[PDB]
Structure to design on (839 residues):
């Protein structure tokens, strides 16, 4: 296994950072991958030496000093995923890629006009069943998981209405219990004090 | 083929 | 112009002792094929490589427990003869234009899960929750929420379909399902997703919204000896129509 | 001060013999070769093992690719077969010959191709399979090969020696004579 | 100790053939795929040149010269491999880097034991039949100078030598012979200079 760092990285939308892989031996070449949420490895770079640039990405490989770096700039939401370096051991008889530990990259969405609100949504098949939608909060807000076992809270999730150039975060809460209401649905976490709780 | 280590 | 490697099936569930066969179509013209094993700790274990139809290198586990082929008239195949719980991993197939001189292009992989038995496999139940009147009057946007619950394992693909065409804009789905009860090791899973449209678009009763969850489960050849419905690979959908007030 | 050196990785695969070779060369001398069958590194001098190592399975993968590349070359060329390169054979002692003092006879097979030979040492006209060693097919600057065969012997005026080399470029297996002269 | 890197074989693609020879005889044909990857160190790892040479039977058909940066056909038999492999940019990048990832990598390992290897020559002088023989045997490396002196004046004619003889076991030998008709009291000196010697070795022979 190749030593890779950082193990995790949270990047605000539009900012930059760098990853690095240290090799304990001479490598023929190094590949860089972006494994998306779908689990598919996206080829980013093939380097035997020097520096290559691909859009907002940039990568360098130094075989003598036995390291490789990957630079991301102007971070976009689609850049999220687990980034891997992989190299061929020039001394290895096994023809195979040796992968780094990986960097889990999260791109913090930049929410321009936050509008925190918790809405109740009725089930299309029945008015009995319903969910609570904490939406339009900015990215600093963290959604705490359920402690009431029968209540269920999903993590936050950013959708992109591309035609309107609009981004928004949302998390969903639901329960079978009757005592559960949307007013205390996200009470376990710190929602903004100006959260719009409608009638 | 060849059975390689690991 | 980017090479594409195909892999079926996307997900696979098997019981201990069963065969688990996975197929791979390398990029047209690539003479070299690789098979890797990626577990949940993001550790990649090389399994075997090919030069055209001929195996060149493989580790001991592959030779003794696996059957691999890359014939000229058929897709490449990697098959576990007797599946074990430790075989649960993402099986990646990569092809390259040369032996060790070019980029290895990887396929989507097969997410294989090997359970003790297939007694606790369940399909998802799907529900669509209509936007609220409060969000419409407040933001002039309407959010639909889809819940897929009670399924096991977490081998599902959720998609939104507006008026018969799959949409991706305004959609976001949970990156990973949550357990309905984390205390159980075979806990059934739940998954949420949202589709947000404009208020005027939701206010058209002609517009049809459908949340579709493709479940990966047992096959027709899989033996099922229980009373409930066979949890086979199936699609479970919930739908809603536009509403005004 | 100046350090002038040439390090060569030489490899081939040969039909119909179905035989491959993989070796490293340093200024004209073998560093090692990989036993293709057993997949082990064979160092030319045993002390070389202390300073270096090589994963021999890398050579086995190379030979497999070279094997397939040879089939490509056989399809690409369809020339009339008409050329073998007969070898030069020289027999000489490793050291100045002194009677009663153990020495080594060198059978130097040079400037030949294909890399396939059959070599027999003869002491007093009969084959000797004891105290004999032999190198793999060593590279030259050009397209041809060379090879060393060795015979340990005890110099005496009663004995004579012959190195018989057989090669496809030879109409008749040639033997080169050697006997002690003071 | 430290593991050596090596040149990994590249796959050739078929499909095209050349108009007609070479390779054995009709009764016994043979076919040889031969490749020499040469790391050239002109002054250690300061100036390094990679020269990969491809041979089919008796014919060198393809080369990769690091000063060129691409494969070049030596004969028409190698042109398909050059056109195929030069259309693979990542191959070419990886190949050009092998002056470092293979050549300079392996030199630093071999610099520990192969480069500094020194074996002292054994020098012997004996007449024959005249002919004065200076036997210089069992030395390494090959760089050596063997001079004949008559009365301290270097003899530049009548020298008959075997040249440098490679024993194949990391030793060298040579026979440098002087054709002289010796007058009474003449001092003949064979002088040998070698990297293993701090001072020149001198063996005298008096007529
Ligand atoms: C990779 O290694 C880099 C090399 O610097 C090292 O610094 C200290 C720790 C010694 O080990 C020295 O011999 C090296 O030159 C580090 O600077 C860097 O932090 C490492 N990064 C990763 C991601 O492994
Ligand atoms: C040759 O270069 C020398 C530099 O030292 C070198 O360091 C590495 C590259 C090793 O390979 C080692 O063998 C070399 O000595 C100089 O000291 C020297 O003056 C240079 N000589 C000439 C003629 O250029
Ligand atoms: C090579 O030559 C032989 C005899 O001339 C012929 O039978 C054969 O078809 C030729 N092969 C090709 C590929 O042209
Ligand atoms: C090589 O020649 C010798 C001497 O004639 C003979 O004994 C031996 O059987 C031959 N071996 C092969 C493989 O031709």
């Amino acid at each position: 296994q190749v030593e890779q760092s950082p193990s995790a990285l949270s990047l605000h939308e539009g900012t930059g950072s760098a990853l690095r892989c240290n090799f304990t031996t001479t490598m023929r070449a190094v590949q860089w991958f972006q494994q998306n949420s779908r689990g598919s490895l996206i080829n980013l770079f093939y380097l035997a030496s020097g520096t290559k640039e691909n859009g907002r990405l940039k990568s360098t490989f130094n075989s003598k000093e036995s390291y490789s770096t990957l630079h991301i700039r102007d971070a976009q939401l689609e850049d999220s995923g687990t980034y891997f370096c992989a190299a061929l051991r020039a001394t290895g008889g096994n023809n195979k890629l040796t992968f780094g530990q990986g960097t889990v990259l999260s791109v913090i969405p930049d929410i321009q006009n936050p509008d925190p609100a918790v809405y109740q949504l009725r089930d299309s098949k029945s008015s009995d069943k319903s969910v609570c939608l904490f939406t339009d909060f900015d990215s600093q807000t963290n959604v705490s998981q359920s402690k009431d076992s029968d209540v269920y809270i999903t993590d936050k999730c950013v959708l992109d209405m591309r035609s309107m150039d609009f981004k928004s975060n949302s998390a969903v809460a639901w329960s079978n219990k009757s005592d559960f209401a949307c007013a205390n649905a996200f009470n376990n976490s710190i929602i903004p004090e100006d959260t719009f709780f409608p009638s | 083929y060849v059975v390689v280590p690991d | 112009a980017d090479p594409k490697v195909i892999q079926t099936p996307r997900y696979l569930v098997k019981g201990q002792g069963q065969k688990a066969k996975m197929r791979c179509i390398p990029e047209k013209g690539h003479p070299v094929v690789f098979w890797y094993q990626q577990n949940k700790n993001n550790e990649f274990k090389f399994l075997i490589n090919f030069q055209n139809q001929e195996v060149l290198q493989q580790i001991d586990m592959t030779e003794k427990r696996f059957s691999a082929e890359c014939p000229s008239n058929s897709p490449c195949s990697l098959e576990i003869q007797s599946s074990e719980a430790g075989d649960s991993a993402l099986y990646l197939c990569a092809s390259s234009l040369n032996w060790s001189q070019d980029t290895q292009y990887f396929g989507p992989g097969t997410r294989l899960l090997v359970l003790e038995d297939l007694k606790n496999v369940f399909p998802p139940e799907v529900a669509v929750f209509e936007p609220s009147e409060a969000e419409i009057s407040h933001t002039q946007k309407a959010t639909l929420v889809c819940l897929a619950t009670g399924f096991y394992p977490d081998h599902v693909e959720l998609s939104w379909w507006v008026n018969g065409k799959e949409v991706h804009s305004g959609v976001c789905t949970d990156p990973q399902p949550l357990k309905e009860q984390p205390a159980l090791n075979d806990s059934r899973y739940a998954l949420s997703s949202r589709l947000r449209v404009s208020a005027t678009f939701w206010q058209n009763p002609r517009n049809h919204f459908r949340c579709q969850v493709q479940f990966y489960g047992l096959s027709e050849n899989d033996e099922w000896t229980q009373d409930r419905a066979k949890p086979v690979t199936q699609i479970v959908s919930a739908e809603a129509w536009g509403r005004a007030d | 001060i100046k350090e002038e050196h040439t390090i060569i990785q030489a490899e081939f695969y040969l039909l119909p013999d179905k035989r491959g070779e993989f070796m490293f060369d340093f200024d004209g001398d073998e560093i090692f070769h990989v036993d293709i069958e057993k997949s082990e590194t064979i160092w030319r001098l045993e002390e070389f093992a202390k300073f270096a190592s090589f994963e021999a399975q890398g050579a086995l993968a190379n030979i497999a690719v070279d094997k397939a590349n040879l089939d490509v070359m056989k399809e690409r060329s369809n020339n009339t077969p008409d050329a073998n390169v007969a070898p030069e054979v020289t027999v000489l002692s490793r050291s100045p010959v002194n009677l009663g003092e153990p020495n080594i006879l060198i059978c130097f097979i040079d400037k030949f191709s294909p890399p396939v030979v059959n070599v027999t040492w003869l002491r007093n006209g009969r084959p000797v399979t004891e105290g004999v060693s032999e190198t793999v097919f060593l590279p030259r600057d050009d397209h041809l090969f060379r090879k060393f065969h060795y015979l340990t012997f005890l110099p005496s005026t009663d004995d004579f020696y012959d190195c018989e080399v057989d090669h496809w470029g030879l109409e008749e297996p040639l033997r080169k004579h050697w006997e002690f002269e003071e | 100790a430290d593991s050596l890197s090596f040149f990994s074989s590249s796959i050739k693609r078929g499909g095209g053939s050349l108009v007609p020879g070479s390779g054995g005889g009709g009764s016994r044909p043979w076919f040889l795929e031969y490749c020499k990857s040469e790391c050239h160190f002109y002054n250690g790892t300061q100036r390094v040149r990679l020269l990969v040479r491809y041979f089919y039977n008796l014919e060198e058909n393809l080369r990769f010269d690091s000063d060129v940066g691409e494969f070049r056909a030596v004969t028409e038999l190698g042109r398909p491999d050059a056109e195929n492999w030069n259309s693979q940019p990542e191959f070419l990048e990886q190949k050009r880097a092998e002056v470092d990832t293979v050549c300079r990598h392996n030199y630093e390992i071999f610099d520990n034991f192969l480069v500094p290897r020194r074996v002292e020559p054994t020098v012997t002088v004996y007449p024959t039949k005249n002919l004065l023989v200076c036997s210089v045997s069992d030395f390494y490396p090959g760089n050596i100078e063997v001079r004949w002196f008559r009365n301290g004046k270097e003899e530049k004619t009548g020298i008959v030598s075997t040249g440098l003889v490679r024993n194949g076991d990391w030793t060298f030998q040579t026979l440098v012979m002087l054709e002289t008709v010796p007058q009474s009291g003449e001092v003949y000196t064979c002088q040998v200079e070698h990297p293993s010697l701090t001072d020149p070795v001198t063996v005298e022979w008096k007529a």
Summary: Residues D 118, 120, 166 surround 2-acetamido-2-deoxy-beta-D-glucopyranose (ligand 4) (CB under 6 Å). Chain A touches chain E through 14 residues (CB under 8 Å). Chain A has two domains: 1-109, 110-196.
